[PDB]
Amino acid sequence: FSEEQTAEFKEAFQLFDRTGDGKILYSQCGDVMRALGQNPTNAEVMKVLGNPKSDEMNLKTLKFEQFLPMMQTIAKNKDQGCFEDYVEGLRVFDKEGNGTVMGAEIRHVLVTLGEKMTEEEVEQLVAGHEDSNGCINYEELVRMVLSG
Amino acid sequence: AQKPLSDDEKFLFVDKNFVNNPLAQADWSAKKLVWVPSEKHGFEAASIKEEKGDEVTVELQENGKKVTLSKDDIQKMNPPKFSKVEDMAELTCLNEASVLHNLRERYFSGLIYTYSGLFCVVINPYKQLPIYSEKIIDMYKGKKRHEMPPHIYAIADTAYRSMLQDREDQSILCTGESGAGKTENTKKVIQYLAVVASSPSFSYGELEKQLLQANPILEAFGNAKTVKNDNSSRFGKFIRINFDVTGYIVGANIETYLLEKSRAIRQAKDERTFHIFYYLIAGASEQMRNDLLLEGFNNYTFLSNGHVPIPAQQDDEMFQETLEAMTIMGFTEEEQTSILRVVSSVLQLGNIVFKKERNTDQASMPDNTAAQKVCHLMGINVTDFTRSILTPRIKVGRDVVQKAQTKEQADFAIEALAKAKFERLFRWILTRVNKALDASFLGILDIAGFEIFEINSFEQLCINYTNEKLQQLFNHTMFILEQEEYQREGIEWNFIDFGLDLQPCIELIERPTNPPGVLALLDEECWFPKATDTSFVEKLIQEQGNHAKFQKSKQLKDKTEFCILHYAGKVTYNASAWLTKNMDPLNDNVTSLLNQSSDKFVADLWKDVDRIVGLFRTVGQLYKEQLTKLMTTLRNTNPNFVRCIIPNHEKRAGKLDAHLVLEQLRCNGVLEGIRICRQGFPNRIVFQEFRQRYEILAANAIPKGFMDGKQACILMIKALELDPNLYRIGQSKIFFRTGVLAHLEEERDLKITDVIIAFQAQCRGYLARKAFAKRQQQLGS
Ligand SMILES: Nc1ncnc2c1ncn2[C@@H]1O[C@H](COP(=O)(O)OP(=O)(O)O)[C@@H](O)[C@H]1O
Ligand code: BEF
Ligand SMILES: [Mg+2]
C-alpha cells in the first residue's frame, strides 16, 4: 500500500473505535477492512485471525500497526465473483424466467445458504428493489452492490 | 456417531448414539417374530413355532405363553432398525400394529408429534413438555422438513413457505375428537407465525401483540369445562392470517361457529358455564362487584353444580389475565366494564322465577327484588319489562292480541332471553376484536370435536356433524381427489379404493331435496302447530328408516331418541325440544324494550332487532348455509392436517390407551393415508418450472433450441439417470416420488453455495461500507 493512501488507511482505522486505545476489536475488524473498500469473505478474515472464538473476539485488540499486515495480505488473493456467475446462481431462482426473483426467494436464500446474512442484512440490503408485486431484478441488484 | 442432546433435546430428537449391539441384531435370525392379538396390550410380538397352514402355532415372546392363531391373525414385524422412526412412511412393514408401536414408543419417550405420510400424528401428552419456546421457534425457522424433527412449529413453517413459494393460500386443520389437543396445536402455529413472519419474552410487532390476545379472550366467554375438557372450546373457530407480497402479517380474522350458549342456562353434571362467569364472580372487586349486582357462587340458580373448581387454574387471577388481554387489544376501561355488568345481569335473570297462579294460571312476580336488580343492568324500565315479559302486548300485525303466558312459558321466555342476550354479546366481542387484528392468507381451523354423552342434545348433533364433514374432506383430498390428477394427466396409474367415505352419513343429515335429512325434516315440521319433539322423530323413520348409518332407538324408556352410525361411532340423540330451538322462539316484547334501552351498550347489542320472533331462516340451514361457506374456501386453499389424537379417557398423562388410540387411527384414515403417500406419486411439477430449476444439475442435456417442455425435461431426468419408478411422466407435469425432489433440491443448492457465499461477502462489503458512511455523517453534524 502507498504512503499517501496508507496514511488515510490509519485514519479510517482509528475512526473505528469508541474510546481510544487505538485498537480495533477482534470482531470489529471485518467492517474496518471492508470500509477500506475490501470485500473479504467471512472466512479469510477468520483465517488471518488465527480463528479466535466469539468470546475472545469481543475482548481482543488490534492496533492499526498490527492491522496493516492483515490488510495487504487480504488485499492480495486470487479470485472474486462477478455478474457472469454471481447472478447466474440468482437466475436459477427465477420463478419462470421473469428475469427477476422475489423478495422472499432472495431473502431466504441469502440467509440459509453458506455465509448466512442476518434477517436485517437481507432485508435492508434489497429494501427498495422489491416493487408492487415485490420483485427484485437480480440482473440489477447484484450490480447495486458490486458496482456500488 | 452424532452430537449429544440434553434431557430437553431428548424430547425433540432421539437417542441414536449407542452401541452397535449385536443382541437385537442377532435375534434377527428368528425373523419368525411377528405380531399378534391382546386384551390389555392390543398387540405383541411372538414367533411362529409351526405354520399349520391357514392356522399357525405361535408363542408370545413375553409370557412364553403358547397362543396359537390363524395364518391371518398375525402381523409382519418391522426391523429394530426402525424403533421410533420420525416419518412412519419409512417403515418397511406397514401395519395396524406397526404404527401403533411407533406411536407407543415416541409418546412414552416424550415425543408426540410424529409424521404419517403427508399429514402428521400428534398423540396428547397431557404433560408440560419443554419443546415450545423462543429457542425452538428459532431452531426451526427456515429449517426444511428433514433438516429437523417433527414439531408443530415445523408444520407452521412448511405451510408458510409453501404458500410464499407456489403462491397458493393455505390451511392447517387439526382433526381428532374432543379432548385430543386441536386448540393448543393451533395456538403454537399462531405463536410461531407471530414471530417467524413479524416485522418466551420477545418484542413483536403491534398487531402481533394483540393477534396474541385474540384467543385468550374468545376462550373466556366461549370456552368452558366439560366432562372431557377442563377448558373445552365450546364453539367453532377459523383464524385467517393475511400476508403481504413479502410474507409479512398485516391482518387476521376469526369466524366463530356454534356458540353453545344452550349451556348458559343449565350446565350438565360436573360442568360449568362459560368460564368468564366465574372469573368475574371471583375476579371482581367489592366495589365493582357492588357496581353490577353480583352475589355468591351457590346463590345463582344459573350455576348448576354450584361452583366447580378447575385444576391448576385460579379464576381469581384468571380474571386479571383475561382483563389484561382486552386492554392489549382496544377494549377501553369502560368498554370492558360495560360488558362485565351484562354478565352479572344475565346471571341474575336466572333468579327470576314465577309462581304460576292457581287462580288464573298466569305467572306471578311476588318478590320483584330479582327483576328490579336486572333492569338496572339493562337500562330498561322496570314496570315495562315486568309487564312485557309477563303480559306480552303481542302484535300479530293483523291485530293486537295482548296475551299472557303461564309461569312456564313465562320462564321459557326469560331463559331464551338471557341465553341469547349473551350470544348477542359473544359475537359483539368477536367483531370488536376482529376489527383490530385486521394477497396471501393462512387458515387455521379450530372446529369442535366429536363429543358423545348420555344426553345428545341438538347442539351436539351439528357438532359431531361438522366433524364428519371435515373427516370426509380428508378422505376426499387424500385418496379420492389426488387419484383424479393421476387419471387426468394420464400417468401410468390405477385406482385403489381406500374404503373411506361418509357422504351417506352426511346426506342422512344433509340433503334437503330428494330424501330429506334428519335436520331437513325437523326444519319445516317445526313450523307446524301440532308439531312436537315426538312427531318429528317418527317422520324421520317415515323416510330414512332404511338407512344403514341410521338406526332405530333401542330404548324408548319414556321419551323418544335415535342414534346415528357416524364415522366416529354411534350416538343416541334425544330429539326432545329440538324443533323447540331450531326456530329460536323468544319474547320480543322485552326485546324491542331493550332495543330502546338507556344502556347504549345493551342498546347497541340489540340495536338491529328486525329478525326476532313475535309470532325467517331455520337454525339448521342458517348453519349449513355458513358451514358451506367454510368448505368452499377450504377446497380453494391447501389443506395441512394436524391429526391430534387423544391418549386416554382418564385425563391422566403418562397413560396411553391401546385400542382407543388404535381405533382413532383407523377412524381417521391414517394407515390408508400413508398408503397413498408411499403407493402413488404424492408430488408433481409442471415441466417449465422443473427444467427451470433443475438444469444447473443437468447443463449438458438440452440442445440450444427451444423445444417441447416434455422432451426437454425428459432429457434432464435421463441425464441424472432417475429410476423410472420414483417418478411418473404426464401431459404437462411430472409426478415424482417422495423426497425424490428433495434430493434434486439439495443437489442444486449445493451447486451454488460458493457463488452464494461469494456474493454474500460482496453484499456484506456493501452493507459494511454503507452503514459506516452514515455514522460518519452524524459525528460531523
Ligand atoms: N401439546 C400439549 N401440551 C400440553 N398439554 C396439552 C397438549 N395438547 C393437549 N393438551 C392438554 O389436553 C387438554 C385438552 O387439549 P385441547 O387442545 O383443548 O383439546 P381439543 O381442542 O382437541 O378438544 C388441554 O387443555 C391440555 O391440558
Ligand atoms: F374439546 Be376439544 F376442543 F374438541
Ligand atoms: Mg378445542
Side-chain angles (χ1 to χ4, degrees):
Chain A
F1 280 138
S2 134
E3 194 75 89
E4 146 223 74
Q5 79 170 273
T6 283
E8 264 112 62
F9 270 62
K10 4 183 139 129
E11 324 188 358
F13 173 105
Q14 352 243 305
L15 157 57
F16 266 119
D17 201 333
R18 34 238 25 171
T19 18
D21 246 350
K23 279 134 138 208
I24 241 59
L25 227 173
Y26 234 50
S27 40
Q28 211 209 359
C29 168
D31 333 310
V32 193
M33 312 218 92
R34 277 143 188 159
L36 283 142
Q38 223 55 314
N39 288 280
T41 77
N42 237 32
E44 298 149 19
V45 269
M46 227 25 183
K47 119 128 79 236
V48 189
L49 271 209
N51 302 254
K53 263 275 226 47
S54 73
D55 26 301
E56 16 219 302
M57 294 264 301
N58 230 241
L59 309 167
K60 268 244 233 208
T61 97
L62 228 184
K63 264 139 259 236
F64 169 47
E65 250 345 296
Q66 308 196 79
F67 189 92
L68 194 43
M70 278 176 265
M71 232 318 251
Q72 327 117 8
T73 52
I74 284 200
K76 342 135 37 218
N77 315 278
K78 1 250 182 101
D79 231 46
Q80 292 98 3
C82 54
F83 219 78
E84 288 29 289
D85 324 275
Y86 262 156
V87 311
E88 126 209 272
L90 302 203
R91 181 172 202 111
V92 199
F93 293 119
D94 231 356
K95 189 86 186 34
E96 338 109 341
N98 353 271
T100 55
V101 189
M102 307 65 237
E105 224 10 42
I106 249 330
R107 265 175 188 97
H108 197 217
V109 156
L110 285 201
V111 197
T112 343
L113 284 68
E115 308 281 322
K116 332 200 247 146
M117 291 186 251
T118 130
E119 23 282 290
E120 325 264 331
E121 275 195 75
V122 266
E123 158 68 76
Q124 5 145 144
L125 170 48
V126 304
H129 298 17
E130 37 225 349
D131 58 292
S132 36
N133 322 159
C135 314
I136 303 138
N137 180 197
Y138 47 89
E139 321 229 351
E140 278 277 308
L141 158 83
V142 221
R143 292 219 242 235
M144 168 259 217
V145 254
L146 257 63
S147 260
Chain B
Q2 297 295 109
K3 235 132 177 179
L5 2 116
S6 79
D7 26 20
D8 284 14
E9 281 112 14
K10 286 177 196 322
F11 275 139
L12 295 185
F13 306 84
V14 238
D15 273 340
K16 225 197 55 267
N17 261 264
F18 274 174
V19 52
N20 346 285
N21 106 117
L23 263 289
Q25 241 315 290
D27 201 332
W28 88 323
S29 306
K31 357 240 156 149
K32 314 307 113 194
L33 235 188
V34 297
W35 294 97
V36 268
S38 157
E39 251 169 81
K40 268 262 264 111
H41 270 55
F43 286 116
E44 48 163 55
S47 219
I48 281 150
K49 315 273 227 143
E50 193 205 33
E51 276 227 312
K52 289 264 66 221
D54 186 272
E55 276 94 353
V56 180
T57 103
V58 237
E59 190 219 80
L60 57 114
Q61 94 159 315
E62 171 34 51
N63 260 263
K65 236 277 94 46
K66 220 108 162 188
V67 171
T68 285
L69 300 148
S70 210
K71 188 204 245 226
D72 42 87
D73 271 83
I74 68 165
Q75 222 156 154
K76 337 120 199 77
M77 212 144 153
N78 237 321
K81 159 222 295 269
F82 291 94
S83 228
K84 313 147 93 130
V85 65
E86 298 283 40
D87 183 337
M88 262 165 288
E90 271 120 59
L91 311 146
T92 46
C93 326
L94 239 167
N95 308 102
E96 228 247 280
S98 251
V99 165
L100 144 122
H101 199 223
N102 211 77
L103 316 193
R104 196 131 57 181
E105 256 24 77
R106 339 193 83 254
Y107 176 47
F108 274 119
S109 314
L111 318 139
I112 42 212
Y113 300 69
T114 331
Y115 269 28
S116 23
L118 311 197
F119 41 121
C120 128
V121 184
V122 177
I123 295 82
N124 188 345
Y126 259 134
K127 197 203 119 135
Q128 316 90 282
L129 322 204
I131 72 249
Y132 308 114
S133 82
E134 217 81 39
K135 214 165 128 285
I136 338 300
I137 302 289
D138 290 27
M139 273 182 77
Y140 284 102
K141 182 146 54 208
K143 240 45 79 205
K144 186 138 326 186
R145 307 84 253 286
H146 60 37
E147 299 216 351
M148 265 285 198
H151 193 262
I152 206 28
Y153 295 156
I155 305 120
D157 216 70
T158 316
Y160 168 58
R161 178 113 282 119
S162 251
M163 147 207 318
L164 280 129
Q165 294 286 317
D166 40 43
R167 297 140 95 162
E168 201 169 58
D169 286 313
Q170 318 268 287
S171 77
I172 310 146
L173 352 132
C174 328
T175 87
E177 52 127 292
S178 162
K182 247 112 42 198
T183 294
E184 315 276 42
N185 293 219
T186 293
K187 302 225 247 182
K188 313 264 120 294
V189 171
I190 317 206
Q191 152 197 39
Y192 176 104
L193 264 156
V195 327
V196 171
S198 244
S199 244
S201 224
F202 196 122
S203 255
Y204 325 76
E206 320 282 25
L207 87 78
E208 292 90 331
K209 247 220 87 198
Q210 279 155 207
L211 154 57
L212 254 17
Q213 250 66 204
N215 262 260
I217 292 183
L218 334 203
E219 272 171 70
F221 18 78
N223 279 69
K225 157 171 191 23
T226 107
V227 307
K228 16 182 66 241
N229 218 287
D230 243 296
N231 164 81
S232 181
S233 280
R234 225 64 203 113
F235 54 100
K237 176 170 64 236
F238 186 96
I239 307 89
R240 158 171 134 135
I241 289 118
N242 299 285
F243 307 128
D244 65 340
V245 242
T246 347
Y248 298 143
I249 272 180
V250 42
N253 249 48
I254 317 163
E255 155 89 301
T256 174
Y257 313 81
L258 356 177
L259 174 75
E260 208 222 41
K261 21 80 135 241
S262 335
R263 97 159 32 246
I265 49 151
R266 273 142 279 168
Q267 332 86 59
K269 181 231 235 174
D270 293 10
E271 299 183 11
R272 347 181 323 160
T273 9
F274 303 56
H275 292 188
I276 177 57
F277 288 129
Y278 311 73
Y279 291 28
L280 182 43
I281 307 204
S285 66
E286 147 186 83
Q287 200 234 283
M288 94 156 270
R289 111 186 279 81
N290 110 291
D291 259 60
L292 332 140
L293 323 169
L294 27 147
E295 317 152 1
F297 262 96
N298 250 175
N299 286 215
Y300 300 44
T301 343
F302 253 162
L303 309 205
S304 306
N305 277 320
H307 163 288
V308 164
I310 178 149
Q313 198 185 118
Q314 170 132 349
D315 313 285
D316 310 43
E317 52 209 42
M318 262 315 227
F319 186 61
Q320 207 44 44
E321 163 189 339
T322 43
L323 267 267
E324 311 205 43
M326 313 212 229
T327 59
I328 323 295
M329 287 271 11
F331 295 30
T332 331
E333 35 272 40
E334 21 126 318
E335 281 219 11
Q336 293 173 82
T337 12
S338 298
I339 346 191
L340 287 193
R341 67 169 85 288
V342 173
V343 172
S344 57
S345 109
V346 165
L347 293 156
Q348 269 228 295
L349 293 180
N351 332 321
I352 279 187
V353 181
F354 311 120
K355 302 217 173 90
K356 132 141 209 165
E357 263 199 63
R358 304 156 151 172
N359 335 252
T360 347
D361 301 36
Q362 297 169 23
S364 78
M365 187 70 215
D367 186 20
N368 286 255
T369 283
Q372 315 160 353
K373 249 175 165 161
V374 141
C375 292
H376 211 319
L377 299 195
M378 246 121 135
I380 43 91
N381 170 280
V382 271
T383 96
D384 263 292
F385 165 38
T386 319
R387 185 240 296 102
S388 332
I389 203 90
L390 278 167
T391 76
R393 178 142 180 181
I394 305 108
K395 238 172 246 187
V396 193
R398 48 220 280 250
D399 47 69
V400 203
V401 177
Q402 124 134 17
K403 196 140 120 194
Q405 334 120 338
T406 354
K407 116 260 213 37
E408 303 238 328
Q409 316 318 280
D411 269 331
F412 174 111
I414 175 132
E415 159 246 53
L417 138 94
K419 103 135 84 302
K421 191 191 178 225
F422 149 78
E423 199 240 290
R424 249 285 216 281
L425 169 91
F426 184 58
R427 321 287 172 138
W428 176 99
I429 323 275
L430 182 121
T431 342
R432 197 315 190 251
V433 140
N434 258 305
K435 166 172 207 139
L437 354 160
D438 175 85
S440 59
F441 94 87
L442 199 106
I444 331 199
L445 181 77
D446 154 54
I447 57 131
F450 177 82
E451 41 178 47
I452 125 179
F453 318 36
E454 255 189 75
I455 317 101
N456 321 267
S457 174
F458 186 43
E459 301 96 286
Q460 283 63 280
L461 152 66
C462 346
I463 251 164
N464 291 34
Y465 162 52
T466 334
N467 273 212
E468 199 118 31
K469 256 268 79 146
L470 190 11
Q471 172 60 51
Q472 190 39 40
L473 162 57
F474 181 80
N475 325 129
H476 187 53
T477 28
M478 273 322 285
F479 342 129
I480 300 185
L481 264 160
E482 167 119 312
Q483 224 127 182
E484 324 262 272
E485 180 63 35
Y486 291 138
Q487 286 150 352
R488 257 190 292 276
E489 267 297 319
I491 54 119
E492 175 211 293
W493 185 230
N494 65 245
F495 172 65
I496 291 123
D497 222 323
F498 285 79
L500 262 135
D501 166 31
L502 348 165
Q503 220 33 285
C505 208
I506 307 178
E507 314 305 68
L508 192 157
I509 176 93
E510 185 147 69
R511 198 192 245 185
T513 49
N514 291 282
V518 170
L519 220 179
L521 298 167
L522 189 93
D523 287 355
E524 101 282 306
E525 187 278 352
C526 101
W527 289 92
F528 195 90
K530 186 211 273 173
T532 20
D533 339 312
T534 342
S535 27
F536 164 60
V537 209
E538 6 288 355
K539 205 144 196 100
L540 224 84
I541 338 143
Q542 252 207 34
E543 300 117 48
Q544 241 92 27
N546 267 274
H547 196 147
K549 281 327 95 50
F550 184 49
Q551 266 202 358
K552 232 193 276 190
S553 187
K554 303 126 183 247
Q555 349 241 321
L556 263 215
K557 34 197 106 207
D558 293 317
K559 220 144 217 195
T560 63
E561 7 146 275
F562 57 128
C563 358
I564 315 166
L565 305 209
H566 283 314
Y567 78 126
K570 173 255 307 213
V571 213
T572 336
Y573 312 79
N574 175 242
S576 135
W578 270 31
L579 14 82
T580 313
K581 315 153 166 218
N582 186 341
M583 210 106 113
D584 220 50
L586 94 138
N587 176 292
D588 55 337
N589 232 238
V590 52
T591 271
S592 332
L593 156 106
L594 260 168
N595 181 100
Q596 247 138 344
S597 130
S598 99
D599 198 335
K600 205 243 249 115
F601 186 63
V602 188
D604 306 10
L605 238 103
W606 312 75
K607 132 115 201 276
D608 315 81
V609 31
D610 276 23
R611 236 246 197 190
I612 300 305
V613 220
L615 204 120
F616 207 38
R617 214 52 114 309
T618 176
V619 131
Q621 176 82 198
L622 203 68
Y623 173 41
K624 176 249 266 262
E625 201 183 86
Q626 129 159 72
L627 189 87
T628 25
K629 216 174 158 67
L630 206 41
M631 240 93 160
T632 289
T633 132
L634 292 210
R635 260 134 197 167
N636 273 309
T637 72
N638 205 159
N640 288 247
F641 304 95
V642 181
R643 322 229 74 169
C644 339
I645 290 215
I646 222 278
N648 64 85
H649 281 118
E650 248 234 316
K651 262 223 255 198
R652 267 225 136 74
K655 168 187 177 177
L656 175 118
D657 196 310
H659 303 93
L660 158 141
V661 150
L662 188 62
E663 209 308 80
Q664 291 193 45
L665 275 140
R666 288 153 67 181
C667 86
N668 244 314
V670 188
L671 284 294
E672 307 69 19
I674 300 186
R675 225 174 145 244
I676 318 112
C677 298
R678 88 165 153 100
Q679 286 264 226
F681 312 75
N683 242 324
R684 49 226 38 185
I685 172 166
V686 67
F687 297 175
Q688 147 59 175
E689 260 28 285
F690 165 88
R691 123 76 151 278
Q692 172 71 13
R693 202 84 157 174
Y694 319 144
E695 180 145 51
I696 201 187
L697 298 208
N700 299 322
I702 303 299
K704 216 158 108 232
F706 298 64
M707 297 330 309
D708 189 344
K710 195 226 233 198
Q711 172 244 242
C713 134
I714 252 98
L715 259 33
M716 304 225 118
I717 279 153
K718 150 223 215 129
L720 345 122
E721 295 150 279
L722 272 223
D723 181 61
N725 201 231
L726 300 180
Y727 71 90
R728 211 35 70 88
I729 273 301
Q731 198 58 256
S732 138
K733 182 197 303 257
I734 326 243
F735 287 56
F736 290 93
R737 201 72 68 166
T738 13
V740 176
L741 239 355
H743 179 52
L744 272 306
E745 198 59 44
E746 240 163 71
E747 280 267 22
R748 172 190 77 67
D749 281 34
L750 260 65
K751 265 201 124 158
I752 33 113
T753 23
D754 317 51
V755 201
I756 300 277
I757 286 146
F759 171 64
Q760 250 154 343
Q762 293 262 353
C763 295
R764 297 170 174 284
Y766 190 83
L767 220 114
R769 7 249 200 77
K770 284 276 127 114
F772 156 73
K774 105 155 271 269
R775 218 88 211 176
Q776 265 205 289
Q777 71 70 221
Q778 358 233 189
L779 77 88
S781 279

